[PDB]
Design a protein around this ligand. Structure first.
Ligand code: 3PE
Ligand code: 3PE
Ligand code: 3PE
Ligand code: 3PE
Ligand code: LFA
Ligand code: LFA
Lengths: 504, 54, 100, 480
């Protein structure tokens, strides 16, 4: 019942932000603020009333809330939304990141701020629709609709220091990657629907009806391959990853745009929700390939992050390595590894958001991103280098933060299933500590390597400090008490794992 | 060795191939009417030969 | 006791001759002449086909073919007159400005 | 056979457009009035469009040994009439700056629309041939309407020569087909063949020559090289008509020919059409990669979109939803092309003399023409097959039809060509929203703006809610 409003409140809020711009330039930021406040409040109300801790595992499908309304009845297509623990957790995370993105773009007094807020709101609504839709056409529709405002933000509001050609190139590369992968997913969806229609005789795009589809070994592999190509593009999985550092480099300089849609949290949800239940045998056969791709992703992202002269590109490759960890966790069939993947996903979202906000604040301080042009910034600033130190400590998997908790449940479950990939991934953890310390040493330690870092810098504002400290508190609480998060998603993870291991 | 991101260039290889193929195909659009008639007759020969073979 | 194959072969010969004249000649007038040859060969082929089946449909299609031929000859000769008026030559390779 | 009054009721758009031709003729003969003749032409086209309702209440049956009127013919007549009305609406502000006679334009548009209606209702090889000529020859006049301009005269010469060659090829194809079958009706092409001898050599040769002519007419590879030149050189409302109405009518009559003829199920023709569709999609997307000019880019776009349509046509015998896919895709392509070419026509109007350049300069259009830029970028997103647009619904239909018939090479072609199209369409969109260094006032210009605005609104609304279009296409079901 509240799921259509969970999707529509960002869209209506973005329309109001665009239309109420004639009342002033400081008006749409407030409208976006109560828009994401209402979205996050609805998500938290669903969390409180769902009773997710007391929910047992009853097998797929098992939805805590559902909504169904016909959209294209010729193909059996409906606006079909459903929420359980995993989707609710990701909707809560998306709403929190939307609140932080509205807060981070508070000082932008641009002439077209209303359209910026509309694009941000539509990206967030598309992400929530990705997390809520259990109709294959609707899921694909949200998965592709979250790309046009992202493209226009990167292309027209982007990194003003770089040329417009570089921003247009990065935005076009991101759009081509995501849309071509989505078209491959749409081909897989259409073939699955047609196979189900040939087997039974009913036009349906419903995820619940497509779970039981009699399929030959080789057609299921192809459909799983199409789904995996889409998710692997947006995971990112090597070699389909470079769009992410190019999009992070040429994103708008506020940093809110980095938290809005470029943070990856939908592809692993799609892998857990759709790739494993719809194609369990094909995923079981593809598991060595995906796990070795995750190993290569971890090592390649770590070596990429160490070899970066740009801090934003370094954080992007950190995201690549962490998502390789999550990809290893997904193709294991372990409940412990799945819960660790959920915790790692939430913790990576929080820590990457903190790192991107701090990098943006550093960029409005010193007007450069080259780590060769900065150094010894610990003595020049008040709050920023210590918070960046904490977030770099978080991203290397230090205990006390949720990143360690998630990645260590991942490695526990993986070693219960596969030992060799687990030990190579833990050497990837060594590599993670290496690049985190390298970025810390090149950015805030040493002497001033240029003249812009030689003089004192203005302190961070109270609002940016408050939201960064909120991220710090959330990461520490997730590290020291992840139990509410583990209890929220225990039923959905159990259903997905039981379907994956009881059908192979 | 990896700082140039070789996998990114390997995946950008199709863009270079598409650019080269488009530049090669644009040579047919020389704007000559006699070449357009010749291309239509060449396509007629190809279509007729393909229908005769199959 | 005149074979349909021989009439169709004659029409095909005239059609490919008109096409060869349309291709190898840079003069626009000879291109229009070649076009008239091809459409007359197609009309002859329709007449042969109609005469083989003993139907008036071949002659009806001949009538439509020559109506088209007269109209396109008029349009093409008007275009040729405009080209000769504003370029003082009929070299069709000269009009090749839009390309790529 | 004889003609009943019910047959005349079923021929109502034909009679209305022909009477409009005669009335506009006599009005020009009375006094050369641009506004009155344009008003009479659009009144006649609207009268035909609303007489389509009486045609629907009449029924679906065979008006002639040549015409068959069914819901398919009604839908295609409606698309052709809408394209002709939009062509007149874009043509009036462009012709307001034309110094020679302006009234012949609407007469030629009316005769071309009459040919489109003929092709919509065609059920005979004679009707197919006459409809193609009745479309092409007013297009000969309209492409070189501004014949004092060098590019327009060049495009007219190229289009006239190449279309006469294609008409001769097509006519020779029908001659060979008639020599084989002995009947010129669509249902009797290969009917006398039996016992698996459907691939008669002479019938295949005649159908190949007709494929050459129609593939010229549909801008299909390798009969596609005329398309960017003729699109660029022609006046922008003429380019609108040539991109929308001619392609729609010729593809509708090709759909009828391949649906009704028993030789349309031939394996060799299917493989040849698959090769043509593959090459058309890939080539039309690849040639538009580096196109600065918007008219040539839209010509290569037309090549690729007709390739997608051909992909939908190949699965006509396999899936019964292929006609549904072609109708939905053609409605979406019509509205997107109407919007794009209407933006080009409105920014090219009035005609600023034959000795001046007609360059578009779409860069930075939003900062002085914001509504036109919004419509133009909506159309560029629609032609890319991006969701929330009707072009995506059409491309989804094409992909579903290709998947159902297991045309995997064509499916991969659609995906690759869609990616290349994404590149150049998004390039056009961001160029619209960039900044420009440097660089109306009547109700007909506002009418053209209204036309492109409702086109953009239809694209968006039917992209997020396509079910009314699906229902009206399912109502357009022909004779079985
Ligand atoms: C790992 C294998 C298994 C998985 C495969 C998954 C495939 C789908 C996901 C990956 C898609 C990769 C797309 C690669 C190109 C991305 C866009 C790009 O890099 O554009 C660069 C360039 C534009 O930027 P610039 O260099 O400035 O050029 C200006 C020229 N005047 O662009 C240009 O100049 C031209 C751009 C043309 C359009 C893009 C190319 C499309 C090619 C077909 C894509 C479909 C996949 C084909 C198979 C890929 C290899 C497996
Ligand atoms: C783009 C390049 C083409 C990709 C698709 C290739 C499809 C193909 O070769 O399919 C062959 C086969 C079909 O499946 P088949 O074994 O016939 O199923 C019935 C009984 N199992 O398929 C199989 O047996 C499974 C093949 C799986 C891997 C093919 C795709 C690799 C993509 C790499 C990137
Ligand atoms: C102990 C023997 C038994 C085997 C057990 C397992 C192996 C243990 C080996 C431990 C070796 C630790 C060496 C650490 C050196 C660190 C100091 C150093 O080299 O500093 C230089 C540089 C400084 O970093 P930067 O921030 O760039 O500095 C700015 C200006 N210099 O720093 C850099 O540029 C970064 C250097 C990174 C070094 C990464 C080391 C990775 C180790 C992987 C272990 C794999 C184990 C398995 C191997 C295969 C076994 C079959
Ligand atoms: C560059 C991007 C674009 C890439 C190219 C575009 C997609 C190419 C897809 C190639 C598919 C190859 C299929 C090969 C076998 C065909 C013949 C066959 O044996 O079909 C089996 C079956 C029909 O027989 P039936 O009696 O219906 O059996 C029911 C089966 N349960 O068949 C069926 O029932 C339906 C079979 C459907 C198979 C899946 C098709 C889509 C798969 C996802 C995309 C391709 C794989 C991932 C990407 C690869 C690398 C790009
Ligand atoms: C995805 C389907 C189409 C959705 C709408 C696409 C966009 C239509 C036009 C809306 C208005 C655009 C305004 C852009 C303003 C840019 C300002 C830039 C300032 C640097
Ligand atoms: C440059 C265009 C490339 C198009 C690739 C299309 C791939 C289709 C593969 C189909 C395989 C069918 C096997 C049976």
């Amino acid at each position: 019942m509240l799921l259509p409003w969970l999707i529509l409140i960002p869209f209506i809020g973005g329309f109001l932000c665009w239309q109420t711009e004639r009342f002033g330039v400081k008006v749409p930021r407030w409208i976006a603020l109560i828009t994401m406040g209402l979205t996050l409040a609805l998500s938290l109300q669903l969390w409180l009333q769902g009773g997710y801790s007391l929910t047992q595992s009853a097998g797929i499908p098992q939805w805590q809330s559902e909504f169904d309304m016909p959209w294209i009845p010729r193909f059996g297509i409906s606006i079909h939304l459903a929420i359980d623990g995993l989707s609710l957790l990701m909707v809560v995370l998306t709403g929190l990141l939307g609140v932080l993105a509205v807060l981070c773009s508070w000082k932008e007094i641009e002439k077209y701020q209303g359209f910026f807020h509309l694009n941000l709101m539509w990206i967030l609504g598309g992400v929530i629709g990705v997390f809520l839709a259990i109709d294959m056409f609707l899921f694909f529709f949200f998965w592709e609709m979250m790309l046009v405002p992202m493209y226009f933000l990167i292309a027209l509001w982007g990194h003003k220091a770089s040329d417009g050609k570089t921003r247009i190139t990065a935005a076009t590369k991101f759009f081509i990657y995501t849309q071509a992968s989505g078209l491959v997913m749409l081909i897989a969806i259409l073939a699955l629907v047609f196979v189900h229609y040939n087997a039974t005789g009913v036009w349906t795009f419903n995820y619940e009806e497509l779970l039981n589809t009699p399929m030959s070994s080789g057609v299921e592999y192809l459909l799983m391959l199409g789904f995996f190509i889409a998710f692997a593009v947006k995971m990112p999985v090597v070699p389909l990853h470079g769009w992410l550092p190019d999009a992070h480099s040429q994103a708008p300089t506020a940093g809110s745009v980095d938290l809005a849609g470029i943070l990856l949290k939908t592809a692993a949800y799609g892998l857990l929700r759709f790739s494993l239940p719809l194609f369990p045998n094909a995923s079981a056969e593809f598991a060595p390939i995906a796990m070795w791709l995750g190993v290569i992703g971890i090592f390649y992202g770590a070596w990429m992050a160490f070899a970066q002269t740009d801090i934003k590109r370094l954080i992007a490759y950190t995201s690549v390595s962490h998502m390789g960890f999550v990809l290893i966790a997904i193709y294991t069939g372990s409940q412990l590894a799945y819960q660790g993947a959920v915790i790692q996903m939430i913790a990576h979202g929080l820590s990457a958001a903190g790192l991107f906000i701090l990098c943006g604040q550093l960029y409005e301080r010193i007007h450069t991103r080259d780590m060769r042009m900065m150094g010894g910034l610990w003595s020049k600033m008040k709050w920023l280098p210590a918070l960046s130190l904490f977030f770099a400590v978080a991203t290397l998997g230090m205990p006390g933060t949720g990143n360690f908790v998630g990645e260590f449940m991942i490695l526990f479950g993986s070693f219960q299933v596969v030992p060799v990939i687990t030990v190579i991934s833990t050497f990837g953890l060594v590599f993670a500590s290496v690049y985190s310390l390298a970025m810390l040493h090149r950015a805030y330690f040493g002497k001033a390597k240029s003249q812009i870092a030689s003089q004192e810098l203005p302190g961070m504002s109270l609002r940016e400090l408050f939201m960064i400290l909120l991220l710090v508190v959330l990461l520490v609480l997730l590290g020291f008490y992840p139990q509410p998060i583990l209890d929220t998603s225990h039923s959905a993870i159990g259903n997905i794992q039981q379907w994956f291991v009881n059908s192979v | 060795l990896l700082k140039r991101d070789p996998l990114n260039s390997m995946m950008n290889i199709p863009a270079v191939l598409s650019r080269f193929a488009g530049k090669g195909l644009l040579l047919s659009e020389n704007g000559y009417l006699r070449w357009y008639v010749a291309s239509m007759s060449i396509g007629a020969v190809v279509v007729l030969a393909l229908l005769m073979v199959l | 006791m005149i074979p349909l194959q021989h009439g169709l072969i004659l029409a095909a010969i005239l059609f490919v001759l008109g096409l060869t004249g349309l291709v190898i000649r840079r003069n626009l007038l000879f291109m229009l002449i070649g076009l008239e040859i091809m459409i007359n060969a197609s009309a002859l082929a329709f007449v042969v086909a109609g005469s083989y089946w003993g139907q008036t449909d071949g002659q009806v299609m001949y009538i439509l073919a020559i109506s088209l031929a007269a109209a396109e000859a008029s349009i093409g000769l008007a275009l040729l007159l405009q080209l000769h008026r504003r370029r003082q030559n009929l070299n069709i390779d000269s009009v090749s400005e839009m390309r790529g | 056979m004889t003609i009943t009054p019910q047959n005349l009721i079923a021929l109502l758009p034909l009679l209305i457009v022909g009477l409009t031709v005669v009335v506009v003729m006599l009005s020009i003969a009375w006094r050369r009035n641009h506004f009155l003749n344009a008003t009479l032409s659009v009144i006649g086209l609207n009268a035909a469009l609303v007489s389509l309702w009486f045609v629907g209440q009449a029924g679906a049956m065979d008006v002639t040994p040549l015409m068959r009127v069914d819901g398919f013919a009604m839908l295609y007549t409606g698309l052709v009439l809408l394209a002709s009305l939009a062509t007149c609406t874009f043509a009036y502000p462009w012709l307001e700056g034309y110094n020679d006679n302006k009234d012949e334009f609407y007469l030629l548009v009316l005769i071309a629309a009459l040919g489109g209606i003929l092709l919509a209702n065609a059920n005979h090889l004679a009707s197919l041939f006459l409809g193609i000529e009745l479309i092409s020859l007013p297009l000969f006049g309209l492409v070189g309407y501004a014949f004092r301009q060098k590019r327009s005269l060049e495009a007219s010469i190229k289009y006239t020569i190449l279309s006469a060659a294609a008409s001769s090829f097509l006519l020779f194809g029908m001659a060979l087909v008639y020599a084989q079958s002995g009947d010129l009706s669509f249902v009797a092409l290969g009917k006398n063949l039996g016992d698996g001898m459907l691939n008669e050599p002479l019938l295949l040769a005649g159908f190949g020559l007709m494929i050459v002519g129609l593939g010229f007419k549909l801008s299909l590879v390798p009969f596609h090289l005329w398309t960017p030149d003729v699109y660029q050189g022609a006046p922008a409302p003429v380019s609108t008509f040539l991109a929308t109405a001619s392609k729609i009518a010729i593809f509708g009559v090709v759909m009828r020919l391949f649906l009704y003829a028993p030789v349309g199920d031939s394996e060799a023709i299917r493989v040849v059409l698959a090769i043509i569709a593959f090459a058309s999609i890939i080539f039309g997307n690849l040639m538009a990669l580096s196109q600065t000019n918007i008219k040539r880019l839209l010509g290569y776009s037309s090549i690729s979109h007709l390739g997608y349509l051909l992909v939908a046509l190949i699965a006509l015998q396999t899936g019964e939803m292929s006609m549904e896919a072609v109708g939905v895709y053609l409605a979406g392509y019509l509205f997107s092309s109407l919007g794009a070419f209407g933006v080009v026509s409105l920014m090219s109007s009035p005609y600023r003399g034959p000795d001046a350049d007609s360059l578009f300069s779409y860069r930075g259009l939003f900062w002085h023409r914001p509504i036109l830029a919004a419509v133009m970028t909506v159309m560029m997103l629609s032609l890319a097959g991006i969701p929330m647009t009707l072009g995506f619904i059409g491309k989804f239909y094409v992909l579903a039809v290709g998947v159902q018939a297991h045309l995997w090479w064509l499916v991969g072609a659609v995906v690759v060509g869609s990616a290349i199209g994404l590149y150049y369409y998004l390039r056009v969109a961001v160029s619209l929203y960039l900044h420009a260094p440097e660089q109306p006032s009547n109700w007909q210009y506002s009418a053209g703006g209204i036309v492109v605005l409702i086109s953009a609104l239809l694209v968006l609304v039917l992209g997020v809610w396509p079910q009314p279009l699906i229902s009206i296409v399912r109502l357009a079901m022909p004779l079985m």
